[PDB]
């Protein structure tokens, strides 16, 4: 089958994930995709794509970086 | 050690020469007790390595993911 770009592993996102329920975030190197952010959740150990506009993500990433 | 028994921060060492093009993804650990929270999974060899948070391209990489 023909493919016209690399597939985006994230097609849908969750908007109601809390920072406290995240083991880690993964930021996928898929810059042409709208959704690059995955969370692995603490309560069940599953991965979900998450809303990149969640304000807590920004402070989470700033703290990781400004070290 | 199993993780359940580990008190050590996960990243012992970091790498400063990881090219953006060789990164499958960055994993940002939720470990505020620790200095190094950024792990890259590499495309060419599939290793996970901790990376220097001052690596040149990381900030722009992360900002682009957010700015959609
Ligand atoms: O392989 C790497 N590290 C490692 C850690 C423990 C044991 C053996 C090896 N690092 C690595 C970093 C960057 C690149 C690379 N190639 N092109 N762009 N980045 C390849 C390997």
From Swiss-Prot, chain B:
Changing residue 7 to H: No significant effect on CXCR4 binding or activation. Changing residue 27 to Q: Slightly impaired CXCR4 activation and clear resistance to inhibition by heparin. Disulfide bonds join 9-34, 11-50. The record marks 24, 27, 43 as: Important for integrin interaction and activation. Changing residue 12 to Q: Slightly impaired chemotactic activity and enhanced inhibition by heparin. Greatly impaired chemotactic activity. Changing residue 41 to Q: Slightly impaired CXCR4 activation and clear resistance to inhibition by heparin. Changing residue 13 to A: No effect on anti-HIV-1 and chemotactic activities. Slightly impaired chemotactic activity and no effect on inhibition by heparin. Changing residue 48 to N: Slightly impaired CXCR4 activation and clear resistance to inhibition by heparin. The record marks 25 as: Important for dimer formation. Residues 18-20, 27-29, 39-49 are annotated as: Receptor binding. Changing residue 25 to R: No effect on CXCR4 activation. Impaired dimer formation, leading to increased chemotactic activity. Eliminates the pH dependence of dimerization. Changing residue 60 to A: No effect on CXCR4 activation. Changing residue 47 to Q: Slightly impaired CXCR4 activation and clear resistance to inhibition by heparin. A motif (Receptor activation motif) lies at residues 1-2. Changing residue 47 to E: Greatly impaired CXCR4 activation. Changing residue 43 to E: Loss of integrin activation. Residues 8-12 are annotated as: Receptor and heparin binding. Changing residue 1 to A: Loss of chemotactic activity. Heparin binds at residues 20-30, 41, 48, 64. Changing residue 1 to R: Abolished CXCR4 activation ability, but only slightly impaired binding to the receptor. This is SDF-1-alpha(3-67). It comes from Homo sapiens. The gene is CXCL12.
């Amino acid at each position: 089958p023909v493919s016209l770009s690399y597939r985006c592993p994230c097609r849908f996102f969750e908007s109601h994930v809390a920072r406290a329920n995240v083991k880690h975030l993964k930021i996928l190197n898929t810059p042409n995709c709208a959704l690059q952010i995955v969370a692995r959740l603490k309560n069940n150990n599953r991965q979900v794509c998450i809303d990149p506009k969640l304000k807590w993500i920004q402070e989470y990433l700033e703290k990781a970086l400004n070290k």
